[PDB]
Amino acid sequence: DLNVEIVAVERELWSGPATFVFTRTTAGEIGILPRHIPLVAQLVDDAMVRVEREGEDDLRIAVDGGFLSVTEETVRILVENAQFESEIDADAAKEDAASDDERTAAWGRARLRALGQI
Amino acid sequence: AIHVGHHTLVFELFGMTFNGDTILATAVTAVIVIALAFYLRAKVTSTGVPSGVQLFWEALTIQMRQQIEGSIGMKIAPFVLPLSVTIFVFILISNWLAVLPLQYGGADGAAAELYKAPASDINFVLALALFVFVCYHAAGIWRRGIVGHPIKVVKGHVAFLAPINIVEELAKPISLALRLFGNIFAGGILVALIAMFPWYIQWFPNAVWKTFDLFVGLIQAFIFSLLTILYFSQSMEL
Amino acid sequence: NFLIPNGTFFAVLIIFLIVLGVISKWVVPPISKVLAER
Amino acid sequence: LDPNAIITAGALIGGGLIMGGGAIGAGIGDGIAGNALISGIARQPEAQGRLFTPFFITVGLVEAAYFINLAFMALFVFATPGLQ
Amino acid sequence: LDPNAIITAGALIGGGLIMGGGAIGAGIGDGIAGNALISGIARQPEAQGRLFTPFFITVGLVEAAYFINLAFMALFVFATPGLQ
Amino acid sequence: LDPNAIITAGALIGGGLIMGGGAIGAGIGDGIAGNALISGIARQPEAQGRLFTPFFITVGLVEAAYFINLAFMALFVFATPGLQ
Amino acid sequence: DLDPNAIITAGALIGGGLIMGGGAIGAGIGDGIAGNALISGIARQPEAQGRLFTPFFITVGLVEAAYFINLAFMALFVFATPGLQ
Amino acid sequence: LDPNAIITAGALIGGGLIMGGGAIGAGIGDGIAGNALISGIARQPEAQGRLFTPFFITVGLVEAAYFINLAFMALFVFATPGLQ
Amino acid sequence: LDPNAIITAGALIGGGLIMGGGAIGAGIGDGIAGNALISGIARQPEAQGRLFTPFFITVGLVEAAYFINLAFMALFVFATPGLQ
Amino acid sequence: LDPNAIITAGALIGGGLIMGGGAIGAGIGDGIAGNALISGIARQPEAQGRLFTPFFITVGLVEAAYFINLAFMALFVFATPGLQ
Amino acid sequence: LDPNAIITAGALIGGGLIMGGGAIGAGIGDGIAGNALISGIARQPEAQGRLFTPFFITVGLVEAAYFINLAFMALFVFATPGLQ
Amino acid sequence: LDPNAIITAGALIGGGLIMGGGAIGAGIGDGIAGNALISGIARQPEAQGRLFTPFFITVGLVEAAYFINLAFMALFVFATPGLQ
Amino acid sequence: MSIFIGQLIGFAVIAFIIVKWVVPPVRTLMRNQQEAVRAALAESAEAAKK
């Protein structure tokens, strides 16, 4: 298996084993499996991370300022900010989406994608 | 000899020839499709657990609806769904019915098939392709007028290539037909070729080719329906 | 020759047409209703 | 030796060349355009609708060449120019 | 010599050219499309199904050419235009 | 057999070669250019407006070559040079 | 004098050679391209090998099918030559 | 049979080969160079001005072969060497 | 003119076509597969065996076509069908 | 017919093949090298001088092959070896 | 006329086809393998020693087909099958 | 009818085929290798001293194939085997 | 007649292949879909009861 570490600037948010790490880099959607080759990529502005763990429900994380680093022994996602699916509130995400401010619009779109409404 | 292009049960009517074999094959395929349709209609289960036939029809309808919605709104082209699903099921049944062991010897060493895939006849593919062609051009006319649609198709997305454009507007039907016919015609020949071998060695290549031809027919039906949907979407826009 | 069309064309079309009719009446509408209800 | 026979044999060979070249070009061009389309879909799943447009723009040209060649092959064989 | 002999020799050579071109085009195009599909799935294993819809389109648009050629090859060989 | 028959057969074969090469070239070049354009639109959809200018330049070069080949095939077949 | 069947068979052999040459070129090129894709995918994501072998074999079948159709038609040309007098 | 007929048929076939090869090369080279140009434009529009220079050098190097082939085709077809 | 002479000339040209096509396909496919293997090994020092396996699959697939073509060339030029 | 007629027809067909192959090779190689150059300039604007020399080496090799083919066509056609 | 003359002409054309196809395949496959080797060297200079193994394997798999083609060309020309 | 005329025509056609194939292979392989080296130099400006070794290896293989074709075409043309 | 026997037993081989390798997967897919819809229905009933 592969160990995933979702780390924020202020603190390390999440850390644990997983089975499939989906995300959307600038080039395009990427799915990391246990022995993926080493890689460094930049997550898109409104990126989203989906961690499929062993014997557990998937974890959806909205990511802001994301960066992905695969090392064949652990996947490390460095995020300026992030929010788990449970913590994300729908109404605020809708309000902040489709905003002129590019940063808040990207954050809102990432929250929408993490929730499931896309 | 291969006896390519020969037709059995050929008759005449109203000063016109009619290859009986292809008519019979089309009739049998239509009977099969109608039987499946009425089996579904009798055994529709909106609330309770669905049947296998209901599952098959549901899967096909969902696939066609998804393709249409991706290409053009279902609210804009509802009939395209029945057209695509009927085309798909017709072609698939016609191609798959050839898998049955209906091939024998014609008493002169030339293989003869009791049932031959109707798509192997130019008339069948011509009918399907021309019907789809007329249908989608009429849909375009309805969507964007009687003179608007010809102008749009002639100019296309870029006006300066209007001459070239016309060519594909004539290639769309032909490419739709010949491809299908061609892909089936090969089968109608391949098995015949395999029929030259002695049985004790002829069985193996025939089995392999027919097994692959199952997938080939599935792919051909899917491609025909999908390209019909896409042509409908292209005709009906703006 | 084999590429030249024949009368069968019309006949084939006719058969296809009726099939489409059935597919447009007793297959697609019930299935769409079932999917919408689900 | 019927001169028309030589002329039409040459016409058949020419039509075969026309069709072989057209098929090679159409097949490889379609494969390349389809590779581009499949890569775009894989990397950008939401770009399918806006990708199908340019894909068919280029496929139009690719098949236009092929079917022009097909028409000229039909002229070669059925209406052999210069036939006596 | 019977002219029809020359007619048939030319027809067979033309059909060989047609089938060779069609096979080259179909093989290369299918290989390229399969390369696109395989690379896309390797990048995103869960994008398998979504990539089958466009793939086949390309394959269709490829195979058509070859199969179209094949059809005409039969016309050359079994019902040769210009035969005496 | 009159010489004009041999000359016409040679002209038909030459025109077939011309069209086969022109097709191959046009199909392959248009496919490659369309691949480039499709990839560009996939990465940057907003760029579709600014992408057609070089793409159509490439397509014009390719189709220009193909149509020059077509004109010379027409010269070969209809008005055969050297036809006694 | 030239036997017409001699010309028929010469043309048939030429046509079969062309058919098989085109088939071999197409099959080799397509299989090589698909195998390159498979090798790159296995290099990238080893655990996706099983998922990759499916589309790889789909493409390989689609290519070898054209190749073997060309084979069959070459056999038609060479062994039971159409139009033979 | 007049020698000139055989010479002219051979010249026509040779010119057809010349044009076919030239068109294949020109079309595919133009397509590849245009693919490079389109990708470069997609990545960065600002590069367009400086990109048009190497693109023109490439297109010139490609079309040079085509035009030399055209000239030698004209030599073959019109003033056939060794026409005696 | 011995008919067997015409038959054998046709068979030799056919076998030459067989071997030319087989060699083109084998060389190009093996080169592409080897390029894949070389790039994979360059990226990963220790991917050797796991890349050799699929590389061997591809090489076997291509060489199968090459050797089938070679065997049919041998059939063409050693037991010529239609000879008499 | 004159033996020189057959020899000259063969020479013309051979020279046509020479030019077809040379033009295909030149066009394809020039296009590929120019594609590399254009991509390099696009990604590295200031690298024009550094990239030109390798590009000129590649083009020199390609045109060396092409012009050797042209010279041997000239030998085939104007100084047909074995002529008699 | 001499039947052996037709036999040898067909043998020469067949050997020419064999060697042309072999040369095309060998050249392009070696170019592709060399492209892979160059990219590997550029990405990782330390790889230069290790890459030569897969590179040598690929070059061997290509040159093997090329030299088998050469051997069969030599068989075709110097010891022509069916040369009565 | 002089058999040597048929022999020489066949030899010239075979040499044309050999050189067309050799030129195609050489041009395309050299273009591919030059593309690889240009790209590598673009990535690593300090790689000019190291990429040249594998580049020269690849070019040596390609030109070795081309010059072997040269030698065999010279044999076919100037000293035709089977001439009688 | 001989070719009829050959094609008949070739079709027998084809049917064996279909039942051995193709019937199990399609049957599993049908079972999965039927169980999923039966679930959905029972879940709707239990949600109404809740």
Author numbering:
A (entry chain H): 3 to 120
B (entry chain a): 10 to 247
C (entry chain b): 23 to 60
D (entry chain M), E (entry chain L), F (entry chain N), H (entry chain O), I (entry chain S), J (entry chain P), ...: 3 to 86
G (entry chain T): 2 to 86
M (entry chain d): 1 to 50
Task: Kindly provide excerpts from the paper associated with this entry.
The mycobacterial PS is made of two proteins, bδ and b′.
Substates S1a to S1e are in S1, and S3a to S3c are in S3. In S2 (where there are no resolved substates) the c-ring has traveled two c-monomers further round (ca.120°), and in state 3 substates S3a to S3c have all traveled on to approximately the same position, four c-monomers (or ca. 280°) further on. The main differences between the substates within each state are that the positions of the PS and F1 domains vary such that the F1-domain (including the α-helical coiled-coil of the γ-subunit) appears to pivot around the PS during the catalytic cycle. However, alignment of the substates via the “crown” in the F1-domain shows that they have identical nucleotide occupancies and that the position of the γ-subunit is also maintained. Each nucleotide binding site in the three α-subunits and in subunit βTP is occupied by an ATP molecule with an accompanying Mg2+ ion, while the site in subunit βDP has ADP and an accompanying Mg2+ ion. The sixth nucleotide binding site in subunit βE contains an ADP molecule with neither accompanying Mg2+ nor phosphate.
